[PDB]
Design an enzyme around this catalytic site. Structure first.
Site, PDB file in Angstrom:
ATOM      1  CD  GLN A 119      -5.757   6.781  -4.513  1.00  0.00           C
ATOM      2  OE1 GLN A 119      -5.231   7.830  -4.065  1.00  0.00           O
ATOM      3  NE2 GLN A 119      -5.961   6.570  -5.799  1.00  0.00           N
ATOM      4  N   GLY A 120      -6.592   1.209  -5.440  1.00  0.00           N
ATOM      5  CA  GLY A 120      -6.604  -0.232  -5.182  1.00  0.00           C
ATOM      6  C   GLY A 120      -7.889  -0.923  -5.622  1.00  0.00           C
ATOM      7  CB  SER A 167      -7.749   0.599 -10.410  1.00  0.00           C
ATOM      8  OG  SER A 167      -7.627   1.952  -9.967  1.00  0.00           O
ATOM      9  N   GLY A 168      -9.990  -1.335 -11.797  1.00  0.00           N
ATOM     10  CA  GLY A 168     -10.170  -2.553 -12.590  1.00  0.00           C
ATOM     11  C   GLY A 168     -11.285  -3.451 -12.069  1.00  0.00           C
ATOM     12  CG  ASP A 227      -8.761   2.350 -17.750  1.00  0.00           C
ATOM     13  OD1 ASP A 227      -7.812   1.578 -18.027  1.00  0.00           O
ATOM     14  OD2 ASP A 227      -8.747   2.960 -16.655  1.00  0.00           O
ATOM     15  CD  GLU A 269      -8.007 -18.599  -0.278  1.00  0.00           C
ATOM     16  OE1 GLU A 269      -7.819 -19.839  -0.129  1.00  0.00           O
ATOM     17  OE2 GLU A 269      -7.757 -17.823   0.671  1.00  0.00           O
ATOM     18  CG  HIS A 277      -5.417   2.430 -14.812  1.00  0.00           C
ATOM     19  ND1 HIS A 277      -6.803   2.508 -14.900  1.00  0.00           N
ATOM     20  CD2 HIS A 277      -5.072   2.324 -13.518  1.00  0.00           C
ATOM     21  CE1 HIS A 277      -7.331   2.423 -13.613  1.00  0.00           C
ATOM     22  NE2 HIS A 277      -6.242   2.312 -12.746  1.00  0.00           N
TER      23      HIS A 277
HETATM   24 CA   LIG Z   1      -7.608 -15.605   1.175  1.00  0.00          CA
END
Ligand SMILES: [Ca+2]
Length: 223
Positions: A174-175, A177-178, A84, A62, A40
């Site tokens: 919410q956020g 997810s996954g 899912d 990063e 999703h």
């Molecule tokens: Ca950062």
């Protein structure tokens, strides 16, 4: 994450941010070329962001790599959220280090009562909106079969589990997810759905990764 804690920088080195000009979903690095998330969470134009803590500042550790392909599970049902799960191949191999590590796939399924770690950048209030800039963590048990299905009659399949607290207050939101659910060193879950966040008698629902290992291996080997 609601009712969790600040994980601490690069303490969850397998946690990924999916970015399309903004953060929209989490994911898990399973090897230097592949990420697993929720179906999703499918979009076009994905960039995978590794080694993050503060997603709003460039802090050094990063790696920002674009997706070369996405593969949603053959039997994904957007209406029921059954199956899912999605695979995301990186354009270029990630460099694995102290801040960027992969998570192992399960050799067997985890039992109820097993303590897991759930993490993400999602909304931290059960009522209202508040999105953190830094990684949030949650320790949560896998709930029994019966407790999961009683909360969601006729909605739970073999490919799902519940985790969290029947008394509410602690959950994914919410956020998130996954994102990963890691139990006894293995990736057992994917943040899938639920009825709101941190509400009483409505635990989070997760994709049961142990059902998918075969698919993941064959797919990654052929792509
Ligand atoms: Ca950062």
């Amino acid at each position: 994450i609601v009712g969790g804690y600040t994980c601490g920088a690069n303490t969850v080195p397998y946690q990924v941010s999916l970015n399309s000009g903004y953060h929209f979903c989490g994911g898990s690095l399973i090897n230097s070329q592949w990420v697993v998330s929720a179906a999703h969470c499918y979009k076009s134009g994905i960039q995978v962001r590794l080694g993050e803590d503060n997603i709003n500042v460039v802090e050094g550790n990063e790696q920002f790599i674009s997706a070369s392909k996405s593969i949603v599970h053959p039997s994904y049902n957007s209406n029921t959220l059954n199956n899912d799960i999605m695979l995301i191949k990186l354009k270029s191999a990630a460099s694995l280090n102290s801040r960027v590590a992969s998570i192992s796939l399960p050799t067997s399924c985890a039992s109820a009562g097993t303590q897991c770690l759930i993490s993400g950048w999602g909304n931290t209030k059960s009522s209202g909106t508040s999105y953190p800039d830094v990684l949030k963590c949650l320790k949560a048990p896998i709930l029994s079969d019966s407790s999961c299905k009683s909360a969601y009659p006729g909605q739970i399949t073999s490919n799902m589990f519940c985790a969290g607290y029947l008394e509410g207050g602690k959950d994914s939101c919410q956020g998130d997810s996954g994102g990963p659910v890691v139990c006894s060193g293995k990736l057992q879950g994917i943040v899938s759905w639920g009825s709101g966040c941190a509400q009483k008698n409505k635990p989070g629902v997760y994709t049961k990764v142990c059902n998918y290992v075969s698919w993941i291996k064959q797919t990654i080997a052929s792509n």
